[PDB]
Design a protein that fits this description.
RNA BINDING PROTEIN-RNA complex; part of a larger assembly; viral protein,rna binding protein/rna; four-stranded antiparallel β-sheet; two-stranded antiparallel sheet; globular; Ribonucleoprotein complex; nucleoprotein; 2 chains
Chain lengths: ~500, ~500
């Protein structure tokens, strides 16, 4: 089956490629300029705007009698990079919404109303944009609405998304994204700035239910087994302030605790195009199905492949303010961060894989990715993840558990006078948990969080990776060369 | 929106102008004598007396049977400047309370019972009077009641106000004003010289609550983030002596610490009239909406505009006692101080903006602004703030904060053996602050104040302005010419 999954993935990407090629020709993009990651972003952006069904309802509500509003409902704009003589600039490409719909309906089928097929791939793109926004600008103008601070922001990977995508992206969003959503849903229940809703998810659960259930379900799919998932089960029976308090403490606990939260890679569509043209310029050996997965070393193959000759803008100006500034390899880091979701990964790990030193925001420099008045083109530094690694989704051992099967209330076939490993107390706890015990949960789990943090603050002594874990060479997807990132100071 | 805010402001001032024009004609003021700032003050004064609802309740309580008390309840007096042959004097203007009420109800609407509409503009005027009193005479006869010393007085900007205004003026009053109020409220709880009360504030908070809450809220709106606002949250749970002790130390800390406290400009109503007549004498180019803001360089435009030809009294006598005395430009300084609230601003900054040397009380001379037996008129020195500056409301960087987003408990997708930036200790502090930790706060925050002062006593090395900050020319609202006030001795 996984080979056929790589094939369906390869077709999915080939569709995105065919759309993008058509989009590039549609706005008049020059052949070399098609490679541009900024152009990837611009097309992907335009597709979000067109596909924003909610905002289209609202647009209609204010579209009024004005013939200028009505004509601009037919036009679609795309700010794109165009180059000449090694210099580069923006152009305002324009095509009608039916032109965009034609390409989309042609490649994905007339039933774009299969919200699953278009929304899956566009969720992944919107997530990549959300990633890049998150590394860029700490979401300030959105958090002035979404009302929460920097630590909450760190756990809120993917929370730059338009609301419609948040259901689609369930697995990969950082726990804070869900938490912030719930906290803001309680504000919406005061403010009326919202419409409440009901949904269903085939292949997962045919349950037919609201944001309340949906969020709690996603929260259960994320939280740590035992106490935190038990708080997740309690959650419908917390009062609203108890929900906010619980959310806060769980969010804080999630700053340490790393239960199942899903990584993903999303390279830009122009990098997928770059992979196609690379395969072409390699004369019939690099095969996209070999790269066609949301997981595993195939992702590092694809990124380092893009690291041969892919192209992007350099503005002389900065996403910065002081006189200290730094090079395109920092853009290359930013791209990598956005592509693999590295924003809360270990910089030391990354420093060894990228095989160059890593950084914090006080040090990070980049451009805006938005097509320029004037600037210059640049191409990729070779092989950049000169070491790779195996991906993953949870803590090494989470927390200390019970005996695995022994030390329970002993059985006795043989008629012999005996001691016993008497354990009726934890047996009665297992009965209490499976019967759904409900008295003293909030505080109980608050305390359990307090002491679990302490236990973890011991467990750190070995709580570090899946036990084969090292930064192997690109000559060593074979995991032959186990080596550590750093000793310390 | 800000253009429309300038328009509503311009209408607000035009109303004040129409009231003042009518007031000037009502007491028989000569056309040139209408410009007089002392006349501005006298009208504004009379309006306070009429609008003092509390003191009108008390007046009724002692009005008794006496027909002389009853007739003088109908009369309203106004001591005003009148001039002849370059000499000047007082006249006791008289009009009935209904005459004053007619002008007010005519221009602001019959519902002067819209306490917001009249009280907003009158709070700003009463604040200007409080400013001028504060620079004049260090509030001695009020502080014999309000029981606190010179340093407390310096932080108590606006504390000359009648009580009713203190709620209205919440943003701009110096922190000491609130503090002194709280300390005197505790004395009132012994002495019974008061009635306690309840209020609500739309557009801000629909909470419906007493001076205790109101003061604590205003105090929270002022105090420094972290320790001082945390003391602000504790405050309801301090004992009464602990409140007094805390108030003292916070007040002392506020002598160094400059968290958010709001500047304002209030030029005299006769200076707004002077702006009108100036516009008139300029034949259709100076526009009041261009000047219509409580903030920004528009204020220096208006003051320097008044600096063309505005007029005021010179008495030969002095608010002074020794044989050393000095000129009308010192009145001009006093006016400026009262107009912009400069009383605790840097004299060096002001010396460069006014483009002439600045002073302390041992050097400051002025008149009483109260219409005279005999004296002479004088007019303004030209362009007086020959340099201007950008306004502001808080310290440059307050105090040193955390890392902004990095150096928290690291996440790990990749299965690799690793060090960590282990920071569980400050993570547990963030949990303690968001859970509302309550054991050891008074002393804890006393200590935090002690050490914060020390940290600040280091941080002074750069703690100086918003980083673009200089005394630019009036030819340079364009901020083109960055230059420093002084090097030192």
């Amino acid at each position: 089956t996984p080979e056929e999954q790589r094939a369906k993935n390869a077709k999915t990407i080939l569709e995105n490629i065919q759309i993008y090629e058509r989009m590039c020709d549609l706005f008049g993009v020059s052949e070399d300029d098609k490679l541009i990651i900024e152009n990837s972003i611009s097309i992907e952006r335009m597709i979000r705007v067109v596909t924003d069904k909610k905002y289209q309802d609202k647009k209609l509500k204010n579209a009024g009698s004005d013939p200028e509003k009505i004509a601009n409902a037919g036009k679609v704009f795309c700010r794109l990079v165009e180059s000449t003589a090694g210099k580069c600039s923006a152009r305002l490409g324009m095509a009608l919404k039916p032109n965009v719909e034609a390409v989309l309906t042609d490649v994905l089928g007339n039933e774009l109303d299969r919200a699953a097929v278009l929304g899956k791939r566009m969720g992944f793109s919107a997530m990549f944009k959300s990633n890049l926004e998150e590394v860029l600008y700490q979401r300030g103008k959105n958090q002035l609405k979404k009302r929460n601070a920097a630590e909450t922001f760190t756990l809120s990977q993917g929370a730059s998304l338009e609301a419609r995508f948040r259901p689609i992206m369930e697995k990969h969003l950082g726990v804070g994204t869900v938490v912030a959503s719930i906290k803001n849903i309680l504000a919406s229940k005061k403010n009326g700035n919202y419409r409440n809703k009901m949904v269903r998810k085939p292949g997962g659960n045919r349950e037919s239910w609201s944001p309340l259930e949906r969020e709690i379900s996603f929260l259960n799919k994320k939280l740590f087994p035992g106490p935190m998932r038990q708080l997740c089960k309690k959650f419908e029976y917390l009062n609203e302030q108890e929900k906010q308090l619980a959310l806060n403490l769980m969010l804080d606990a999630s700053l340490i605790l790393k239960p199942q939260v899903t990584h993903k890679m999303i390279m830009p569509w122009s990098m997928w195009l770059a992979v196609k043209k690379y395969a072409e310029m390699n004369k019939g050996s690099p095969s996209l199905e070999d790269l066609a997965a949301y997981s595993g070393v195939r992702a590092f193959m694809a990124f380092n492949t893009a690291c041969y000759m892919s192209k992007f803008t350099i503005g002389k100006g900065i996403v910065g303010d002081a006189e200290i500034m730094e090079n395109g390899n920092d853009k290359m880091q930013t791209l990598a961060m956005a592509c693999f979701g590295l924003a809360y990964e270990d910089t030391g790990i990354v420093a060894a894989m990228i095989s160059q030193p890593m950084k914090k925001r006080y040090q990070l420099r980049v451009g805006n990715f938005n097509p320029p008045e004037k600037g210059t083109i640049k191409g990729t530094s070779a092989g950049y993840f000169h070491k790779w690694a195996e991906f993953g989704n949870r803590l090494p051992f989470n927390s200390f558990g019970t005996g695995e099967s022994k030390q329970i209330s002993n059985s006795g076939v043989f008629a012999v006078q005996r001691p016993s490993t008497t354990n009726i107390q934890r047996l009665a706890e297992l009965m209490a948990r499976n019967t759904g015990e409900t008295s003293d949960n909030f505080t109980q789990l608050v305390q359990k969080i307090r002491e679990q943090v302490g236990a973890f603050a011991d467990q750190k002594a070995n709580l570090r990776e899946f036990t084969g874990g090292y930064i192997y060479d690109i000559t060593d997807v074979t995991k032959s060369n186990p080596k550590i990132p750093q000793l310390g100071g």
